[PDB]
Curated annotation (Swiss-Prot), chains A, B:
The UniProt record lists the keyword Repressor: no
GO CC entries: cytoplasm
Family designation: Belongs to the peptidase S15 family.
Protein name according to UniProt: Xaa-Pro dipeptidyl-peptidase
UniProt lineage: Bacteria, Bacillati, Bacillota, Bacilli, Lactobacillales
Disulfide bond positions: none
GO molecular function annotation: aminopeptidase activity; dipeptidyl-peptidase activity; serine-type peptidase activity
SUPFAM superfamilies assigned to the protein according to its UniProt record, in alphabetical order: alpha/beta-Hydrolases (SSF53474), Galactose-binding domain-like (SSF49785), X-Prolyl dipeptidyl aminopeptidase PepX, N-terminal domain (SSF81761)
Active site location: S364 (charge relay system), D484 (charge relay system), H515 (charge relay system)
Main location: cytoplasm
Length: 794, 794
């Protein structure tokens, strides 16, 4: 049993139900003259889209059952005038892909449905109720995660409408009435206003367009644009990641690198003419959601922008030029910027197939650039679905004055990520020209990123999208995994605090995954919600999308099929609590420790000697392995007697002294207890079990499940440079053996500690997987009488 | 660097090269009047299939390079009359998907190609040599594993031929000139001669047909038939696996269960008429090879047979009825047996689209049924590619009188596997009728499989295909993973010894995988070999397939891109060696131990107490973890001073006494040493990086790579029941504390122990992952003076 929760079902009255059923050729136009048996047989047989003649459909009826002693065929032969509730759903559950005995009992089909959160109609005693039961059924999530109508679509139900060259809606959502055999996958070259490769010419960027062939027949469609720096190819460079096994250095060496923009060379203007594209796409959609929506009439557009394959320029990680080159594609889609058929710039081509409404899609670098482009208020951008996104690039490689890696990306920085996406180097003819420009940018990025001091700067400030949040004009969806330690959740939290204040409509989805999607889960119909959303925002159809579901949806960390509905994500969801350490290694609301406890950090010496992995170190560390926990102070609460939900950003105050005139402190909150927590990533339940359309590719149904027992889980943590004790934006010299007050915030969370578990505050320094790993020892002393951890709880 | 070894390239003379290039519209019909520059530009531009106009192709030429200082476009502008070798392959390597600097240097492109086993022409000094260099290039394996021509195919190169309704060959292989947008995926119902569900009627079996639409225009095509008991759905029943935590029992309780065949009800005969199918397929191809060949004109046919969804009957695991129902599909394909459009049996439909030549495909249960069907000599079956196959069902759940599981399938048996594939239960209307018949078969299988005694029987003998090997008339390819501990390699070895003797053509492929495919590897062009093979065997085209590559190809366990070419797989590949234990725990060709060493087997008591996994136990066991190695005797050789390759089936003799009047002995050979062995499964290198055709789905390029260091690897092992000391087919009572001589064979292998490693013989009893796990202790005493291990080495 798992709850296939459904939030995207729009309440529909019977007249509108009838209208939609007739429109999709499911219900006869004159349904009122049809008797009950004739109706029920036709509606079941129409759902059985794999049988193509009426004879074939009829033979299929023997394979369904209304009870443990009667097939559907034999039921129909009795000339029935109604159908009991259990009888109908003994048929329905099979249409939904459930199996009798193994999933449900003949005796209790609606009991089963109730426990998988599937709706059912209690009363089906006439033609009207039977039609409404079948309308709800078509809108019912099947075992493979998709509503029954999409299973019918996978069986080709909607190919009968192909060639009608128009959108068609069902329960407010676009359905697959487009000839996906004829879908157009072409390539153009948009002209930016940039000259990042210093050749005196506007940088052209290769742009991949997937559009329904129906656009060749006058239908204008919206576009879902994905700004993907990876789209042209990904250069592996992990061996070039900067060494992190180095001692800390004096941050007062900071001299505040400055941001300087690239040369501008303004592009020509569009002149009205257009010739069709002359190149077919070779790169594929990187998110099944886009292909799903493409089968349903929405074009998808993909571009790497400057520095990527078949494009001019260099990557400049996080810079305004990455925003501008990426936004240039929307300007072309809205008909304001020029594009060409090839890189000779001789023949202009337009996005005249586009209805002028653009939304964005994609995660990570792709969701990062949606935040960036949104702040420019570019005309045409109506909505973003920003997934797993960086909202400020300092927050991806730094924190509180210190150099802090993404998980499994030790030593990565702006210069590494620039090369990673510098895929025009793969064109060896362009390599001759681009290689020197790429080298110059490598030197500038390596210098300005300032790994020596870890400090913020005017340079880093250029990559802080949150300081232009006032520019956002589009509606807003953010998606983020609560356990994403790659793009850490601080990014989405801090942009949400700004965006939630703004007049446009906004939602937030937080799932239990790490750097990972949530479009194909058992527990939430995210794809159907986005369908409803994109139809409202990009087709201007009034389908209740602005009233359909809650602002914030937060997947529960104890039950994967529980989704919390909240008005916000902020400390304001809970109430303030403060825990104080004790001299006995405890953590209590009335704690009153007074000792000065010390720990000797041994940098990366012992970690690199032991040869263990970074994730092995982290787990043994938070579990309190003696060998790895020795460089730390641990404070445990007593076992919780009721579950408690920590919400928002915990804030630590800590008075500390260091043996050297420099250093860093890390602070973590850990849940203690041996139990089966959720799997790190969703478990695959039906591999390629979802149809994106008719013969249009698949996705995999999955969901988090109880894992092998673990003894602990990291809730949240953060790091801080000692020399920033006074100012997050300005370092200061410090004396060894003098106490300083650090006050800083941890990563945002939404985490239910279950009863019977303990909460551990850990104070330490070197994080083998995310800080620098010094080659020297350093002793820290913490004044327990001036240390505390404060967080909000619900 | 990895060797993309190529065995499928057929030597072609220049006249035949020219003929094929013209035929695929790559070379102009009057190529002799074209000057060098005009030729080279056209041939490069034709390879660039993603650009669709000549203008677009021309602009692409600037993106390639002939040297570190000249693009291809600028080279062409110099009016060249030849091209140097390094200049050509600086272009070619980019067409092959390699990247300059990151993969190869401008200075040494053919050096790079040499080290990836890519061919290159040393001399390109005129139009003739340039055409031959381009012919070889089109036939050159690209970085994604596919020959360049298939990359062009992915780019739609061959859609220009769609609608010509005929096969087209290139280098002896079928190429994708079929309209895969119009491919036909339909369903019929073949009528068997069986009544396994006791309803008085022939069992019908649902059959899924994928055929090129070109068959509607009179083209007859061959069929690749996959007998898949899973095709209708897979019922999970792992929790029902029989308990293996039980004490051994007296095998003389054996009373020799007998095999009895199901009722026969002969099917009607075909009468000439045929109407087209009325049902579309809902299940997908389960092997990318089939879809690849389907884009190239070969229909693929899939059927679960009796007991599966939309079919009558019950599964009877391994029985003749599973062979007969599966063979019924070939008889329909050859036009000898009837089929209907639906299960009313009212309308006949034929396989008149089929040219009468059938081959089989698929692994595991699917490759098992190919061996079974082959022994019947069914008319139409021309060749099998039998992968990961059982050749005798006793050898899947038993060995030497003992109950021996497949890896991770403890407690599985015939009755479990029957239910697993009993997918017509998913049709709840048929469940009413089938459930009682399934229950009766469960009782009969559970009883006759005789898990109590572990013995062979007349019943088991019914599932021994090797005793009907004389019936095989088809040519033969076997594929098996040397590390498959699910379908253990004994199965393929023993059928190979019979098949290799027969007059028809035969090959064998042994890879380093476990229960896993090898159609998409870096190191071998298996897919292209099968293309050449299927064209020779099913289209009757003389394309050198019978002379193209060696009989046996064996992937090396030390270098994943080394494939051994051998005439056989047998002890005859090496020379006999015998090692004898010592009283000091050593193993030497001149060993001379004389003690009686004992070990106390503690069944599953300690294993189940420790809660560790079965694979954890196995690794710690073969490494010699004190806690788990105590119930065993270990004998180590000294380190090897030269690599040695063990070949064939090692044979152990061992004199043993047991503390109880029953028992079992296990014997393993283990390679000792801490080093990076190959990954358990291939590492994904280009996820979905292979195109099956044009817009026709993908496969993933992969290859075994060095893994994290391990301290040991299992080479081979086997088990034996003490009471079978006299007869493998007949148990005997035994006295406790009396010595018996066991003489038996281990699993077949082909394993190079590297110099510096040791060879360990382990004698033990309870294998926590594959034998019964007794609840009592039992002490074994081994007479070292009458114990030895003999194997052949090369
Ligand atoms: Ca430029
Ligand atoms: Ca029957």
């Amino acid at each position: 049993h798992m709850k296939y929760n459904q939030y995207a079902y729009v309440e529909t009255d019977f007249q509108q139900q009838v209208k939609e059923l007739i429109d999709i050729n499911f219900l006869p136009k004159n349904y009122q003259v049809w008797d009950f048996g004739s109706l029920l047989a036709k509606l079941v047989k129409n759902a059985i889209a794999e049988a193509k003649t009426d004879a074939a459909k009829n033979a299929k009826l023997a394979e369904f059952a209304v009870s443990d002693h009667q097939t559907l065929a034999d039921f129909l032969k009795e000339k029935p005038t109604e159908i009991g509730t259990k009888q109908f759903y003994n048929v329905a559950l099979q249409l939904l892909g459930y199996h009798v005995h193994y999933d449900y009992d003949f005796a209790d089909p609606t009991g089963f449905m109730q426990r998988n959160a599937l709706p059912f109609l209690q009363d089906i005693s006439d033609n009207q109720k039977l039609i409404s039961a079948f309308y709800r059924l078509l809108n019912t999530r099947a075992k493979n995660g998709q509503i029954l109508l999409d299973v019918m679509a996978g069986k080709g139900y909607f190919t009968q409408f192909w060639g009608q060259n128009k959108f068609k809606f069902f329960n407010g959502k676009s359905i697959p009435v487009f000839d996906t055999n004829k879908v157009i996958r072409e390539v153009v070259y948009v002209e930016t206003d940039l000259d990042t490769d210093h050749d005196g010419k506007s940088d052209l960027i290769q742009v991949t367009v997937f559009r329904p062939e129906e656009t060749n027949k006058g239908l204008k469609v919206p576009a879902l644009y994905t700004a993907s720096p990876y789209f042209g190819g990904i250069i592996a460079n992990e061996k070039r990641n900067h060494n992190v096994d180095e001692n800390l250095s004096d941050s007062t060496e900071w001299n505040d690198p400055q941001y300087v923009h690239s040369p501008i060379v303004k592009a020509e203007k569009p002149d009205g003419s257009s010739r069709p594209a002359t190149e077919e796409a070779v790169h594929k959609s990187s998110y099944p959601l886009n292909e799903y929506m493409l089968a349903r009439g929405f074009a998808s557009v993909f571009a790497g922008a400057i520095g990527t394959r078949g494009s001019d320029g260099v990557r400049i990680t996080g810079a305004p030029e990455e925003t501008e080159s990426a936004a240039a594609v929307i300007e072309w889609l809205h008909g304001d910027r020029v594009a060409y058929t090839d890189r000779t710039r001789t023949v202009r081509t337009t996005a005249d197939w586009c209805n002028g409404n653009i939304g964005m899609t994609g995660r990570s670098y792709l969701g990062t650039l949606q935040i960036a482009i949104a702040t420019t208020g570019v005309k045409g951008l109506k909505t973003v679905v920003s997934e797993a996104a960086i909202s400020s690039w300092y927050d991806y490689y730094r924190e509180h004055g210190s150099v802090i890696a993404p998980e499994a990306c030790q030593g990565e920085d702006l210069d590494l990520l620039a090369e990673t996406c510098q895929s025009n180097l793969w064109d060896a003819g362009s390599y001759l020209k681009i290689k020197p420009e790429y080298d110059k940018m490598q030197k500038q990025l390596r210098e300005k990123e300032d790994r020596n001091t870890g400090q913020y700067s005017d340079f880093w400030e250029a990559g802080n999208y949150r300081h232009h949040a006032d520019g956002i004009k589009c509606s807003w969806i953010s998606v983020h995994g609560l356990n994403d330690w790659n793009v850490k959740p601080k990014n989405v939290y801090k942009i949400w605090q700004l965006v939630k204040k703004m007049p446009m409509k906004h939602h937030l989805f937080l799932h239990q995954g790490p750097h990972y999607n949530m479009n194909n889960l058992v527990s939430i119909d995210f794809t159907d919600l986005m369908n409803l959303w994109f139809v409202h925002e990009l087709l201007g159809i009034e389908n209740n999308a602005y009233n359909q579901w809650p602002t914030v949806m937060i997947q529960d960390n104890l039950q994967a099929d529980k989704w919390h509905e909240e008005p916000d994500w902020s400390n304001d969801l809970g109430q303030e609590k403060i825990y104080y350490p004790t001299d006995e290694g405890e953590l209590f609301q009335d704690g009153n420790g007074k000792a000065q406890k010390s720990f000797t950090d041994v940098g990366g010496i012992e970690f690199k000697k032991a040869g263990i992995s970074e994730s092995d170190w982290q787990y043994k560390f938070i579990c309190g392995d003696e060998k790895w926990a020795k460089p730390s102070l641990r404070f445990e609460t007593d076992e919780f007697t009721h579950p408690t939900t920590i919400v928002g950003r915990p804030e630590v105050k800590v008075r500390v002294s260091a043996s050297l005139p420099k250093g860093e402190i890390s602070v973590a909150l850990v849940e203690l207890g041996e139990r089966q927590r959720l799997t790190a990533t969703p478990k695959f339940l039906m591999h390629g079990g979802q149809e994106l359309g008719y013969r249009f590719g698949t996705d995999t149904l999955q969901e988090f499940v109880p894992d092998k027992k673990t003894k602990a889980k990291l809730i949240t943590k953060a790091h801080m440079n000692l020399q920033n004790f006074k100012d997050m934006k300005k370092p200061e010299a410090i004396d060894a053996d003098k106490f300083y007050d650090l006050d800083f915030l941890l990563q945002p969370t939404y985490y239910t500690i279950p009863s019977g578990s303990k909460l551990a505050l850990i104070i330490y320094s070197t994080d083998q997987g995310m800080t620098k790993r010094p080659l020297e020892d350093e002793t820290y002393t913490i004044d327990l009488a001036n240390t505390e951890i404060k967080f909000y709880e619900k």
